[PDB]
Design a protein around this ligand. Structure first.
Ligand SMILES: *[C@@H]1O[C@H](CO)[C@@H](O[C@@H]2O[C@H](CO)[C@@H](O)[C@H](O)[C@H]2NC(C)=O)[C@H](O)[C@H]1NC(C)=O
Ligand code: NAG
Lengths: 497, 497
């Protein structure tokens, strides 16, 4: 059905404008007959996940580039794709009119949209809030007698979360992360700055802080919301930097280890929420594999940890092999998950670049790397922001896939939206990455996965200006003959029986 | 931080086993928000000052005994709690390896322990010594030229006291008492038995005895230890009984009165230790009020007496009102202080009974009675003894809160120890006893006090076998709903503001 309404703000590409009565959308999903493939296409010239279809050849002649499926090379299973429901996202979303809201939520969550199946939920306030608060601000309330969710949860995040689950077809998983504990638990008595939990693991402070996870899970359950997972802390490495500007709680990897084994693990275990998974680290790539070595080589800690959450700041480099690769090699059965990614945080960049194709490519380039290095899921940061990249109470603005202009009851889906979508719409939970080898050096980024039902998906990104002819060989069925346009992203889907 | 390792020895309760690398201990104190109380419980079944918390609510759901705090009804202020560093006690402590020694001292003195702030130091030898001696055994040395401290003081008592002071949570006060003088001052030329100072007050025997107090004080000051008080004599009435087998020095109350007036008072006052307080009596409670009347109705004596020290022999009965009550009534500006308590002389009982609960109850009961009869401090006898209840050069008659087992480098903390701790750990110097009103006749023993900073502490002892439902009201906070289990002791603490 409805095509993209393009508009340009002077960047390398266009945004798709949506409002109360209109938004681009897909027809209900279809599978091509055996012997044919589907192609979805997004180009910098302005194509937006366009659907075409072509035949699979029995034979192939040539000297051009060949990508070969290796359906026997089985690698990680995929958890999913999605984003974060911050105070800022919720607040921009709910500022729109109600039909525009429905369409924004449809874009992300519906099958007419891009099929997100993960939502990350901050436990209380972070920098993408308009104010600082915890769930237990009453001083010294060790018993958590005055614990409670404010309006940010009850009138913004939770109503929106229910609306997303209602709209989605895939089961959605929710992931929680705290930025700061209440201040009376912290060495410096502030939400920001350098400090950690007072005393040491096993004690009253650390036990209270774990009880607070449970009170959080209890509160959300009273609103009929269950979590798949919690992280042990958002960016623990931050609470160790003096003058750190926004909400935080610092743990050395040793402190995180000890916290997990003495308090958080056991407390989660002895409760009605014991099925909730715990992920550690929830920090940048370069903290790996050191942090994993420290936490996972202690079996009292390890037994509690399901997986490792990593952040991906797209404007910064990190060698994937020395970080994810090595971590996987050391701990093959502890899943790697990407719990937050963003762009536009470097000191010299604009937060928001409406229509930026460059930033689209940065997302997809980096998601393919993730999958080539064992990552099982990928979560975006803010689901929506304003044209400043906000609100943010320390003015720490960044870009977002959807940009909301309240004065116009309008939102803009950016290249990032569709670059994410090329993954999230076509790699349901359960899919398994498999091998794919190239027949010669080339400029493409490609990944191949197999769906739970047996059928195939390949994503292809071209970061060169040049058109690249290529053929994908699947020995079950034959050859896909196609072209990858310069600065383009394609997803390919086909049946194998 | 670390829990009690239980061992039973066939009595009604357990002891806590501590050795060179393990001892049960506490976290630093952590004060909960207004409207929350802390509770420490110990039970005969095996709980040992376990911490729990709960609410002070605004509605009253109980229908039983009500105990209402009357914070504006003020009584005595507390000097503190502690025990005696006898030769015996030091021999036992030093029997352990140094790491175990530190655990022993921390148990008593430290914040991670029960926070003693009083140590009684015998002047020379008593029955808990391994030989008889005084600081001046060279005969006819009236100018006390050969006065000096033996190894017992320089190598055992003193270094341990330094070590306790270093560990202590609070400023510690030292109290000294003499058992016997050099026998060349005595009517009987013997360390024990019926015999007092030769001659009469004013003469050279009495002057020399008085100067011995100053020489003692001088010697300990060279080791950088100052005293808070000294008693006029330990158990003066003992020396009047024929055949008294332990070191003694007999004084009739008339003789104590004149000794203070003519000799001990003026000598102390003319000296560099004029600030040391002098306490009279230092003997059993049935000598009161009569001893007070004799000494304190004479003004030449009363001006040097700062308080009356009493002993508690826990195996024996003694009405508090006719003794302590009546004493306070006749001399209400003269502090009462318990300077020695012990239990276990019953010819038919084991001197040390490892894990005896009845014996702890005896300690707490007597402490509560004490506080309710104006007593401002409480000092236990031997800090530590071996398992036969020694070393004692006469005979082993009494228990101690800690029992050292040298051959296993381990020590045992008795119920006694926890029963004292219920008081000592939570009532700092400066605390003041306040009203606590029972709504109806009951089986509990309770006392209430107010910390220097205004917060509340209440101790509640259940000597019966039946559980008692209990409400405690603080007019400025609300109602504390609780149960006092059979054979238990609780201490409650809260903010009032
Ligand atoms: C929301 O945007 C839609 C889509 O652009 C707008 O509808 C278009 O508006 C122009 C001007 O009226 C027309 O010439 C197009 O034909 C319209 N297309 C369709 C499919 O309706 C619409 O006006 C916007 N709504 C608001 C309130 O601005
Ligand atoms: C805590 O909660 C209770 C009950 O909801 C309320 O009456 C009380 O005022 C609260 N206390 C504070 C300090 O906010």
């Amino acid at each position: 059905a409805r095509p993209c309404i393009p508009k340009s703000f002077g960047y390398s590409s266009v945004v798709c404008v949506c409002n109360a009565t209109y938004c681009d959308s897909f027809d209900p999903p279809t599978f091509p007959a055996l012997g044919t493939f589907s192609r979805y296409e997004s180009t910098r010239s302005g194509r937006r996940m366009e659907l075409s279809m072509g035949p699979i050849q029995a034979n192939h002649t040539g000297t051009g580039l060949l990508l070969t499926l290796q359906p026997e090379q089985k690698f990680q299973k995929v958890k999913g794709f999605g984003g974060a429901m911050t105070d800022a996202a919720a607040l921009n979303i709910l500022a729109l009119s109600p039909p525009a809201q429905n369409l924004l939520l449809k874009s992300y969550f519906s099958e007419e949209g891009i099929g997100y199946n993960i939502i990350r939920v901050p436990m209380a306030s972070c920098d993408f809030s308009i104010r600082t608060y915890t769930y237990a601000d009453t001083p010294d309330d060790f018993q958590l007698h005055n614990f409670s969710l404010p309006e940010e949860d009850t009138k913004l995040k939770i109503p929106l979360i229910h609306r997303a689950l209602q709209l989605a077809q895939r089961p959605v998983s929710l992931l929680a992360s705290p930025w700061t504990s209440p201040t009376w638990l912290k060495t410096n008595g502030a939400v920001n700055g350098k400090g950690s939990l007072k005393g040491q693991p096993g004690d009253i402070y650390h036990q209270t802080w774990a009880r607070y996870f449970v009170k959080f899970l209890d509160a959300y359950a009273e609103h009929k919301l269950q979590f798949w997972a919690v992280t042990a802390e958002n960016e623990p490495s931050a609470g160790l930097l003096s003058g750190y500007p926004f909400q935080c709680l610092g743990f050395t990897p040793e402190h995180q280890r000890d916290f997990i084994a003495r308090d958080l693990g056991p407390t989660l275990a002895n409760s009605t929420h014991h099925n909730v998974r715990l992920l550690m680290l929830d920090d940048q790539r370069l903290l790996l594999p050191h942090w994993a070595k420290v936490v996972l080589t202690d079996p009292e800690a390890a037994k509690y940890v399901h997986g490792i959450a990593v952040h991906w700041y797209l404007d910064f480099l990190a060698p994937a092999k020395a970080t994810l690769g090595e971590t996987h090699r050391l701990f093959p059965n502890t899943m790697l998950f990407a719990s937050e990614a963003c762009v536009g945080s470097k000191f010299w960049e604009q937060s928001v670049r409406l229509g930026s194709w460059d930033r689209g490519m940065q997302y997809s380039h980096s998601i393919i790397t993730s999958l080539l290095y064992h990552v099982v899921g990928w979560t975006d940061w803010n689901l929506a922001l304003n044209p400043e990249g906000g609100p943010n109470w320390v003015r720490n603005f960044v870009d977002s896939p959807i940009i909301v202009d309240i004065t116009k009851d309008t939102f803009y889906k950016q290249p990032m939206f569709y670059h994410l979508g090329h993954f999230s719409k076509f790699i349901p939970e359960g899919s398994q990455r498999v091998g794919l080898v190239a027949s010669q050096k080339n400029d493409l980024d490609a990944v191949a996965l197999m769906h739970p039902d047996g059928s195939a998906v390949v994503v292809v990104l071209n970061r060169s200006s040049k058109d690249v002819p290529l053929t994908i060989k699947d020995p079950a069925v034959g050859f896909l003959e196609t072209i990858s346009p310069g600065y383009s992203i394609h997803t390919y889907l086909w049946r194998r029986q």
